[PDB]
Design a binder for this molecule. Structure first.
Ligand code: 4WI
Ligand code: 4WI
Lengths: 306, 306
């Protein structure tokens, strides 16, 4: 038992991380087969990053302007192209460590692991959710751009996120691996702001199920509620609506615990209207919304990856 | 910016994990050079694990009783021996993926990453602290024994923990890699219990420094306190004493923020006596004690590993 913010093992991704230097900008790239993916603002400099014209900037570049370091071995760039907000650097060597992979775009509410990297060297790994406002609450410093987020499904790495920038509230924005931003953000230094967030209701419920599975039952009650009556309360506390599909997805957790989904909603309702009164759930004094129903089943049942 | 429970990249450890089967027990082993390390209760069965005599049990075993699977490749055991609570399985192949490593025993208060494994296959990675009572609040299911905890220091993996068991309160106990338990626990199914814990005061302070670095300042104040007056309050709230050495270790964080350590103690004092009054710190409604001063500097400055 126990419940932790758990990331996927990062080794398959670690073997893909390289260092990309162009001019005075160094960031991280993702090396799969004979292509290195990186944020296109690597072609920019300090005065470039105000309002840039990336197509203009890229035609002025040469293959030899891009220094790619795979550890202590330099990769010769033999081609380059822009795909939306990412650069594709064609290099003369296929990465022998290329895992089976996909490029998948995730939904707000879904989670993924981030391998934070500096100078092409992995620094740490942690779990993140895509917020309803298409930001992520990450941990990123200068030089972390190009770090990727990912999920693992048996042996296949589903890359979902590449890091590009930090917003003024300290949250982070980036693209999928095809270079399309999550949310209404651009890779320019303008006055962009996250925009209002909501709590991911289905995830809170999944985490309450994790708590019951782990022996925290104090918030359970005999009351119930209709889906519509619950959603009236969700709206008032800035929770997003619960759909019948969410109820269906919570079915296995409901069935393992014997607590009907709508009964657990009634519990969440009481937790929202009364707080927690000095108690904790799974070591938290807040309602946690960054575990999906998938995350809970995986951890409270023990799926591995090979 | 941002602050997350961050684990070390797990790839160097992933390449060491194997599956050890003996009789009807399967668990994880750690393969370094030509030795596989695993918990010695793998030689036990259901009626063996009540009150066993492991030396008696081991003389009755043969090399061929131990089936070691490194992925889809079986390792021939050519020798075996017991070192305290771990088995050392000598195999005929040195692990070509052996990183530079050490076996180090950590102190209560120190943190480490855990690579949770089932059937020799890594499942997830997360960060843990050694509690003052020598337990750890992990996430472990059946078959997770032999999963290791570790730190990384540039290129060298310092293995500090091997998982052995879960205690009735849902917390976990294990050994260092020389087979010596952390705390007063034995690898038998008796009525062992964790024993009372305390909050790791120096870590709470480090995390308050992380918060200031990240822009949470509401808990700061003009008051100060002597070390002795603070320790009178720590004792009352079950915090463990702060030493001058802790104050020295917090020096760099004090110097980066401009907040004297004893001023931050005065802040902690007020947080202990008044609670947080509906506010949060680094997204937490509790005082967090599983980040060391090292962890905070690493994350709020960006050290990598290669
Ligand atoms: C890539 N290495 C960095 C990572 C940033 C730096 C600190 N934390 C991070 O996640 N990315 C950038 O420096 C991008 C890059 C220029 C500016 N930038 C920012 O993240 C900036 N933010 C914005 O411009 C804003 F608010 F609009 F998002 C900064 C103010 C420096 C934090 C470009 C091309 C967006
Ligand atoms: C190794 N794969 C397991 C991991 C356990 C199982 C559930 N969560 C875990 O971390 N280790 C064990 O099964 C050890 C092993 C026999 C019993 N055991 C326990 O963890 C048991 N606990 C205790 O006996 C106690 F409380 F004393 F620690 C159990 C009740 C099954 C949780 C031996 C040799 C200790």
């Amino acid at each position: 038992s126990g419940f932790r913010k758990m990331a996927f093992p990062s080794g398959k991704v670690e073997g893909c991380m390289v260092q990309v230097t162009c001019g005075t900008t160094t960031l991280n790239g993702l090396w799969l087969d004979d292509v290195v993916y990186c944020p296109r603002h690597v072609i920019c400099t300090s005065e470039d990053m105000l309002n840039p014209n990336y197509e203009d900037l890229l035609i002025r570049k040469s293959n030899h302007n891009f220094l790619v370091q795979a550890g202590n071995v330099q990769l010769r760039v033999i081609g380059h192209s822009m795909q939306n907000c990412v650069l594709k650097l064609k290099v003369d060597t296929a990465n022998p460590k290329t895992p089976k992979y996909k490029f998948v775009r995730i939904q707000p509410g879904q989670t993924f692991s981030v391998l934070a990297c500096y100078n092409g060297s992995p620094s740490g790994v942690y779990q993140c959710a895509m917020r309803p406002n298409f930001t992520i609450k990450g941990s990123f410093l200068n030089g972390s751009c190009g770090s990727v987020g990912f999920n693992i499904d048996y042996d296949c790495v589903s890359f979902c996120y590449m890091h590009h920038m930090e917003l003024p509230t300290g949250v982070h924005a980036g693209t999928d691996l095809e270079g399309n931003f999550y949310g209404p953000f651009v890779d320019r230094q303008t006055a962009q702001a996250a925009g209002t967030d909501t709590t991911i209701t289905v995830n809170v419920l999944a985490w309450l199920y994790a708590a019951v599975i782990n022996g925290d039952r104090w918030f359970l009650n005999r009351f119930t509620t209709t889906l519509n009556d619950f959603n009236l309360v969700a709206m008032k506390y800035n929770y997003e609506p619960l759909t019948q599909d969410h109820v269906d997805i919570l079915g296995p957790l409901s069935a393992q615990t014997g607590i009907a989904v709508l009964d657990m909603c009634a519990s969440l309702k009481e937790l929202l209207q009364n707080g927690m009164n000095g108690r904790t759930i799974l070591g938290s004094a807040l309602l946690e919304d960054e575990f999906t129903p998938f995350d809970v089943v995986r951890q409270c049942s023990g799926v591995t990856f090979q």
